[PDB]
Paper text:
We recently addressed this puzzle in studying a GTPase-activating protein (GAP) for ADP-Ribosylation Factor 6 (ARF6), known as ACAP1 (Arfgap with Coil-coil, Ankryin repeat, PH domain 1). Besides its traditional role as a regulator of the ARF6, ACAP1 also acts as an ARF6 effector. This involves ACAP1 functioning as a coat protein, which deforms endosomal membrane to generate transport carriers for recycling to the plasma membrane.
A grouping of 12 contiguous ACAP1BAR-PH protein dimers were embedded onto the cryo-EM density map (map resolution 14 Å). Interface II is predicted to be created by a portion of the BAR domain in the dimer N+1 forming a binding pocket, and a portion of the PH domain in the dimer N forming a loop that inserts into the binding pocket.
Author numbering:
A (entry chain A): 1 to 214
B (entry chain B): 215 to 361
C (entry chain B): 51 to 105
The structure:
């Protein structure tokens, strides 16, 4: 992103600068499309996960109750109780890992696509409205003859507006591109990091009781 | 253990950045309010390798039947005038050598700020965006004819 | 369905990383977190194999 946009030539407005403004946009759009694919797959894991733990919790009640109804044995009567809480306690750790997974999907990825391209697009929108404005401001300035002074003055007043506000706009657009370059790595790295924290935390809950359960 | 270690470098890098885009933001609103100019870009006539160098947009007449005028980016270099076809793709010659050229201020065109470059092999029509860009482009060429 | 869902998700996360420039974090760190994730899925698969075997 950052180096597909010449910040250097944004007041100058060279074919270099114009080539860059067209080239940088395709990686923002690529990226936006990949961000959405993870936000949907993430909810895909949240629905199958949750359906799996609804099936799991319901099964755990029924495997224990069927054994409790089983014929009398005093070591089985205590052992199954140790088992029942272990079975559910491991699940609670796993329900918590979906909810942690859910929170990071909101804080990082859903936030990134919802918020983080808004200001670049608001600058991009007005910047191509000013580029279009500038190109005709110059067209209408070039195409009026010398004896048509008044029409030339009107078009040059519009150009002075267009060239200034297009310079104004190229800086913002340079800014919000420079922001997303840095931001993009940090949020996905944070997201794999917060994910596996909840994994380490879910697996430790089932290991903290591994000794008692053995 | 890898997570928390990396997470400490990761946060510091984005703390570093969070400052970083604040400095660019801080200069860009100083630039926008106070020094942000509306005049058109002006080339720089500075000596380079091979003699005088200057580069910038000019209007010229195309192979449309009316001779329709149109905007291209032009460079003066090594006693030569070229024009750009697309950026990074190779340029086209306008005058073989500017030092066998004449540069006509052209008072009989009605075309605002137009000049004509008439050289030994080749002629070419041109137009500047402004009377300043006319007198500097005509002078950059006239000094180039005097090289 | 959960493992397919998770596996597709971990494939989706990797896909962000490769679009950005190659750097120590994306290239190595980010992949090491995500391959341990595919390994954890397979261990989860052996548990659904043992739940089915047991049953």
């Amino acid at each position: 992103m950052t180096v597909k946009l010449d910040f250097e030539e944004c007041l100058k407005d060279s074919p270099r600068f114009r080539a860059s403004i067209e080239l940088v946009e395709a990686e923002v759009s690529e990226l936006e499309t990949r961000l959405e694919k993870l936000l949907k797959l993430g909810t895909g894991l949240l629905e199958s996960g949750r359906h799996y733990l609804a099936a799991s919790r319901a099964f755990v009640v029924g495997i224990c109750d069927l054994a409790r109804l089983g014929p009398p044995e005093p070591m089985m009567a205590e052992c199954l109780e140790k088992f029942t809480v272990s079975l559910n306690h491991k699940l609670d750790s796993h329900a918590e890992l979906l909810d942690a997974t859910q929170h990071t999907l909101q804080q990082q990825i859903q936030t990134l696509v919802k918020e983080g391209l808004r200001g670049f697009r608001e600058a991009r929108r007005d910047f191509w409205r000013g580029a279009e404005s500038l190109e005709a401001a110059l067209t209408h300035n070039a195409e009026v003859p010398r004896r048509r002074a008044q029409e030339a003055e009107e078009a040059g007043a519009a150009l002075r507006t267009a060239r200034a506000g297009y310079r104004g706009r190229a800086l913002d657009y340079a800014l919000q591109i420079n922001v997303i370059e840095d931001k993009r790595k940090f949020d996905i790295m944070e997201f794999v990091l917060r994910l596996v924290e909840a994994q380490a935390t879910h697996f430790q809950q089932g290991h903290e009781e591994l000794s008692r359960l053995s | 253990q890898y997570r928390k270690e990396l997470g400490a470098q990761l946060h510091q890098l984005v703390l570093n950045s969070a400052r970083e885009k604040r400095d660019m933001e801080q200069r860009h609103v100083l630039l926008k309010q106070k020094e942000l100019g509306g005049e058109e870009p002006e080339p720089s006539l500075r000596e380079g390798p091979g003699g005088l160098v200057m580069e910038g947009h000019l209007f010229k007449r195309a192979s449309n039947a009316f001779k329709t005028w149109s905007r291209r980016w032009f460079t003066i270099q090594s006693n030569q005038l070229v024009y750009q076809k697309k950026y990074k793709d190779p340029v086209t010659v306008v005058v073989d050598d500017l030092r066998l050229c004449t540069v006509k201020l052209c008072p009989d065109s009605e075309r605002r700020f137009c000049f004509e470059v008439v050289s030994t092999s080749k002629s070419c029509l041109l137009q500047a965006d402004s009377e300043r860009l006319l007198q500097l482009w005509v002078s950059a060429v006239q000094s180039s004819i005097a090289s």
